[PDB]
Amino acid sequence: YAYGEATVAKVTVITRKSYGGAYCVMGSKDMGADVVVAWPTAQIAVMGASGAVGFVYRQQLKEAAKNGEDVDALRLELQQTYEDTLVNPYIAAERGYVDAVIPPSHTRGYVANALRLLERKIVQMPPKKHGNIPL
Amino acid sequence: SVTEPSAEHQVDIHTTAGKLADLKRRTEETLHPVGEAAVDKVHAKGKLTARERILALLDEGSFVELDALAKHRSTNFGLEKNRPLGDGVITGYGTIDGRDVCIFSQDATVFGGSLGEVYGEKIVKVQELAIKTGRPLIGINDGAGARIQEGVVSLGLYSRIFHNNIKASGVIPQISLIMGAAAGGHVYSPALTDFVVMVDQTSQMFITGPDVIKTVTGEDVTMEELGGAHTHMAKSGTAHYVASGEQDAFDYVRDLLSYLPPNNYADPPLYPVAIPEGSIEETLTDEDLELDTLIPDSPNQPYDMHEVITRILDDDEFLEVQAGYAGNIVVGFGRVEGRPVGIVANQPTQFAGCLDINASEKAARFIRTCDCFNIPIVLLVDVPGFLPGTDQEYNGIIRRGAKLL
Amino acid sequence: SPIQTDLLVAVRDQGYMFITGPDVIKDVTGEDVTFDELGGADEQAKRGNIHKVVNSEAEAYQYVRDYLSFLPSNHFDNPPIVNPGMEPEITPHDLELDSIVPDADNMAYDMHEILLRIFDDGDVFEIAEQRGPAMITAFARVDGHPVGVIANQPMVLSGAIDNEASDKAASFIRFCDSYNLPLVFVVDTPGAMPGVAEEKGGIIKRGGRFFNAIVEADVPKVTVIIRKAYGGGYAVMGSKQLSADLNFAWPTARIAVIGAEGAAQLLVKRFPDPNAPEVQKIRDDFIEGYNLNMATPWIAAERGYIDAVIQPHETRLLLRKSLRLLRDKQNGPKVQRKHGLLPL
Amino acid sequence: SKISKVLVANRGEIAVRVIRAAKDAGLASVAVYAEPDADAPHVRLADEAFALGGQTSAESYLVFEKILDAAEKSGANAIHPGYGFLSENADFAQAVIDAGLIWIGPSPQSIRDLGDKVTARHIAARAKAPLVPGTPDPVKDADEVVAFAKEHGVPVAIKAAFGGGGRGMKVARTLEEIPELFESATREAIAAFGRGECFVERYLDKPRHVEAQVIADQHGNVVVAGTRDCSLQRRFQKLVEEAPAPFLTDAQRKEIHESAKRICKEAGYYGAGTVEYLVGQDGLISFLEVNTRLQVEHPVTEETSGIDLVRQQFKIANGEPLDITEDPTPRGHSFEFRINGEDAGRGFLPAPGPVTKFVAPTGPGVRMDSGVETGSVIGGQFDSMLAKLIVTGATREEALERSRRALAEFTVEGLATVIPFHRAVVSDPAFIGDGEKFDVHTRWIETEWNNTVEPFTGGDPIEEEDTVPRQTVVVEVGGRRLEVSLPGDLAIGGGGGAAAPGVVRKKPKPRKRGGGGAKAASGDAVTAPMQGTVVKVAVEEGQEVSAGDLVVVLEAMKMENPVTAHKDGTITGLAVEAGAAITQGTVIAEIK
Amino acid sequence: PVTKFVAPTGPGVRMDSGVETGSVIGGQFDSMLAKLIVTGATREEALERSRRALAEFTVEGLATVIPFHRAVVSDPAFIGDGEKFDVHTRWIETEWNNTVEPFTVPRQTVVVEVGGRRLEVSLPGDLAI
Amino acid sequence: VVEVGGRRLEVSLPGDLA
Amino acid sequence: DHEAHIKVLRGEPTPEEMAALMAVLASAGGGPAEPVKKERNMWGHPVDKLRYSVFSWQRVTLLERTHMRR
Ligand SMILES: CCC/C=C/C=C/C/C=C/CCCCCCCCCC(=O)SCCNC(=O)CCNC(=O)[C@H](O)C(C)(C)COP(=O)(O)OP(=O)(O)OC[C@H]1O[C@@H](n2cnc3c(N)ncnc32)[C@H](O)[C@@H]1OP(=O)(O)O
Ligand SMILES: CCC(=O)SCCNC(=O)CCNC(=O)[C@H](O)C(C)(C)COP(=O)(O)OP(=O)(O)OC[C@H]1O[C@@H](n2cnc3c(N)ncnc32)[C@H](O)[C@@H]1OP(=O)(O)O
Ligand SMILES: Nc1ncnc2c1ncn2[C@@H]1O[C@H](COP(=O)(O)OP(=O)(O)OP(=O)(O)O)[C@@H](O)[C@H]1O
């Protein structure tokens, strides 16, 4: 609520992990982050790969279990493939949830530029007496 | 020329009549988007479907469905081979007691009710409609989090939904029914709405599942202990009502709405009442005279403050809120001469009526809801002070007691 | 001063409007022109400087009384509510809509057959009928509340949106927004009328003004698509993307970037051998596939570009329910400022 | 061979009737339906149903290939044609026989011979039937017609040798009319029937229509099951029918019963059939027609004579001899009332519409044969008849009394019907009679009946007071049950709500273009006034036309409506072709 | 509740009915809803017509004896050999194969007086007027 | 005015009924 | 005459019964009486309690219209 209410300039720098509901909380774009940048080490995903594999490959793991295979090594291989495919900044950059994937040294420059431009933000909420934040 | 048995014939799709029949076939398919066996299994579990829940809450025949024919567009992990109509949430508008509401209802039979991109867009659409129209939004929540085969797109839709809940906060009444297991991202939207009604023993809310809890902490816990309606009433103070069943939950929602205006600037729903003339003393009733003997002679003796509440309110009717939580304070709605009022009252029968952390936060947010929606408040006061104890200090009686102030 | 007003009503053969008369035209420029050719009532109604032509002053007065009967006295107040609550159930007239649209896609039909049935009664009060006759701009009532109706007329020029149709719609939309009338869009159009004459006549800016007006308007916007919604016709005739509030389509709706024949034509621009039998076979098969899979309601419905596909008989009562929901619409967020600019 | 599965090549009430007869006989039944009939009762009642496709008769029930394909696919071994469509198409009867199916009907030759009017006249003369004075052969010229009319006097009817549906005749009252009438007759008989042949006979001024039901087997036995009187006709099509024929001498009645048998034997006829006659004001009988099909009216004969005539058709088509050896004695009296979807308040014009309610009468003496039910829809594509009400009693008086009851009970809502006419005529002295004669005749409905039926408006609010919402409540006062309609704004006593702020009541405008003071705008589009089928196009593109010129004929409810040029100009965009289905408001052409 | 009631029609059928669609049957009165009367030229024909009419007869929302009638009209004990039949006044409770499956606001009153008469006026309890 | 079977029937009442 | 009249759609009451019916209905009819006017009093109206951004379009379409509408 606090982040979504806020109308000052909101800049996000993702430095590794941003998963799930915590991704939504920590200054996601659709919560109104004005500038979102990610370092090359950013990992933006629904959940960690060991959890995700359980559900996205549960059928294959069950078939391998019926075949009596080394399903532990199968899980390791599927998890490595999930990490290599999805657990990175680029899927969010493809969706435009990340505005730029930057070398970490660029962070201060992107922040300074955004903050200089957003001194006045012409944004508004619907008229209300006050909100009703959870208490 | 060719003549088909009636079982395989379809009216020629090139004619207007054939296009009408095609729309009928598609509409029929939307009534059971994952096949009839799933509906049969819902009824076998004693639940209603998302559609039946909408049609039970709303006034008969008032529902207009939107995006009935939506289908997801994901191609990850073979999702494209299963594209159920409506994408697992039913959305639209209608009336409750003749006043217009916007509504959505999540369908646990479609991917466990997990939120995909199109599912999220549908919810966002009815949120935006409610906000622009200044009409209450009712969400019926029942879903296993983000639809994991869809990527971070589901997180982007969650963020859009939360941002809409925050925009609407204090603008239109927002009511969340929990009618199944709401997991992960599904829990925050209820928390941002104004009222939460959970169904006893058949609905749950939790961020993290019991199995992850077991892995990280070693704690064994059932999903019912972790997130049940009783837990969210009595412990965490998140549920405003625990219904004994789905119809009881709908009745509570209709009662809530009857006290609320449609938006933060409309006039409240005043009931017509016959007001007797004369002075207060001329107008005293026998039930009023019963208050003169309510207070025990000894100051050490409690009494039930509901004896005051039900005598000052019309028809003795009082809709209590968070009845099972922080029972040392009582809050709820009633009417005085047809005017909706919010009651806040100390309850001598629990902790001598002391204020504590939980009672303070219960009354604080109740008062702020009433003041958002222009409902006047009546305080019935019998408070000896704050509940003493180091646990109260360490958990923040100063900071959290300041919220009621 | 008259051209500033909202409604110009001229008496035939009696009312004329022109800057310079025939004499001065002849003497300065040598060209000769009659009062009728220069500025007769019917000519000015076709040019769109006049909104109505009538045969007598009594008829003009009655047209004024009817016109005012749909409107508030001012920007702030409320219009009359006339015959609320008639016919709360599905009528035979509603059921007549299920077969009103011709089977063949080439067939023109009169849009008034629909407009006379989807509102509270036959009181569809048309304004500027002679201007841009491929477009209807009318007042009607829904549950007794007045609304502005913008509808394509397939009977005339296939319902294509020409220059005068574009500026008629634009000015009617701005007027209706100014006096808080909800807007109902009834769509059956191939989009903008192509050709050198329309381009030189200004079709780009006039369409731009139609787009500008429809997005500017704060009033409730509801759309019903009947058959065609191609290209800019789809976009401008109250699409959801241009901020329409509720969007319905009949099962005969066809929503696409271009019609089947235009898609087939560019298909055949490549490997062009249009005399051969085989390319005519290829065109026929392409058009068949396109009208089955592309130019339909169903892609827009599955993407949620439209809110519902409806049986035609539902339309009247569904319009009532929708505009009841939208009655208190607040349009925002908008930044208050001196004014919006428009292509001009 | 023997019938085992009957395909009912028809729709509506007659299809239901034959399906029911097949179930009684223990035969399997196959329905066929056009797309408009996909939900019809007969489609749901038959043991099987096959979709012919197509929207109109010309592309469904009239298509031999489709009906024979449905029979092949269903494995039906017999076809019953009902009435209309192909029931009297001799080439269809032959095609059915060539397919090896049992044709439940008369021989193709009998159909062809009795369908040719002048061959039928020769057969009747050979049978020594009573004939009206008339020409034995087609007349060749208006001068020959004038010579005939000079011999026999006036009026004279000139009639098409193949015509039907009441269009087969014109009448000349004065000699000078003959050339124009003959021109019109030969023209329109060529146009409608493809044959120009015309013949001339004495026109009877106020005749009754009387007809004999025949049952004839393939072994040459014939039984006259009874007579009907069908004199209550509109546009020469029947509306009310009764059995036995009342107010006939025994000499007349026996002459009918005997001439019908002679005629059938000369025709070689077998099956059910009917011999139609006219009875003059002088009481002279005159042969009129043989119908080579089951009659629409057959159930009043069934009720009075105790014979199931459709099952008799099955027996005859099985080739069994008649088990009835002698003409039944009628018991009681029966009326049939055709429940046509026609508004008697607008000259019995038919209109399509939804059957939002249908409550048949029940109880003593009532039989209902209906092709529709609550929720049915009547499209513009087929005949207007919804149902038939048959009322039977011990006497003509008791049948009239029961008819007044049953017609008071009969409720139909959502489209116009002739029920208000039936309610009148069963109470009209001209049709009650004096106990020995009655005044009705084949032109009485148009030229004598005091038409007081108010035009149908359904539920439409028309006056200002109609727009006000209403509530209906049951009040009991002293025990009396009253139904009381209360306006939603009743300002009685302290009541109010006469206007919420700004509410105005005014007369609602009809859902029609413009004011009624003018026909049309100056616009160039000729637009279809109704749903229908374009049956004829009378113009071509580039033709110049003048106001009033015929542009197309649209058939709806099997009636022709001419659509005509509203202005002079050039036909500039002819968009329709014959056989095209068309919707109201469709642009047919632009006149420029 | 009589949620649906579709009497048979057509040749030889008479329906005498005390109920229609939407009627409610309570326990206060005898169970008879209606009488279906079927007539034919012969006993055999009347049975054939009865098998038709009872196959058409649709009643929904409560149990009825229609399945019993559908059996007995096809039962050799009632069709008879053509000169006798085997039914008797105990043939249903015994001897018949019972293969039928089991089925699966107050008014306001105002006592007015008008001249010499009392008149109770009874109104619906929610009359909005 | 009351309509009873299509008859008109004036009924006159006091102006002060509840 | 274009008032919507009471109609007795079924039944034929005797004049005594018509009088009892109409007297009872006229006693039931109540509430509004004559069309009194609720006097306009905009003090403390809800729209005045809302926070509006300085550039909020709702200042025109909600606040101003609510004050001006008559
Ligand atoms: C929320 C924010 C809101 C913001 C909104 C903002 C608001 C909106 C903005 C606000 C809107 C701004 C509005 C600005 C106002 C416009 C400014 C006006 C200036 C002019 O625009 S100023 C033109 C100067 N002017 C001509 O052009 C003559 C036309 N141009 C020609 O070229 C004419 O053709 C010409 C010149 C040849 C003749 O002039 P004619 O007037 O056109 O007509 P004619 O001569 O043919 O008539 C018949 C003639 O016969 C004569 N005559 C008459 N009676 C008798 C008699 N009894 N006996 C004898 N002789 C007689 C007499 O001469 C008469 O003449 P007349 O008609 O009486 O003058
Ligand atoms: C931010 C949100 C996140 O990060 S997701 C948080 C954890 N993800 C979850 O799925 C929560 C736990 N989900 C589940 O396993 C169940 O749905 C829960 C909620 C425990 C309830 O179990 P229940 O529905 O009774 O039995 P079940 O799990 O066998 O049935 C689930 C059916 O739906 C599916 N499903 C479930 N969750 C998801 C999901 N998140 N994404 C995609 N699909 C999901 C399952 O595959 C199963 O479908 P099916 O029966 O196999 O055809
Ligand atoms: N000579 C006549 N005088 C008076 N009326 C006549 C005469 N011939 C025919 N009619 C009228 O025509 C009606 C029907 O005529 P007719 O039976 O010849 O045609 P139809 O029923 O159309 O024939 P079809 O079986 O070929 O369709 C008769 O009921 C009678 O009303």
Ligand SMILES: *C(=O)CCCC[C@@H]1SC[C@@H]2NC(=O)N[C@@H]21
């Ligand atoms: C005797 O008076 C002391 C015991 C009572 C102390 C009570 S407890 C609850 C109230 N809160 C507080 O701080 N003192 C009061």
Ligand SMILES: *C(=O)CCCC[C@@H]1SC[C@@H]2NC(=O)N[C@@H]21
């Ligand atoms: C057409 O829709 C089906 C047959 C019904 C019309 C036919 S025409 C000849 C018969 N005579 C009559 O009145 N109806 C029957």
Ligand SMILES: [Mg+2]
């Ligand atoms: Mg005939």
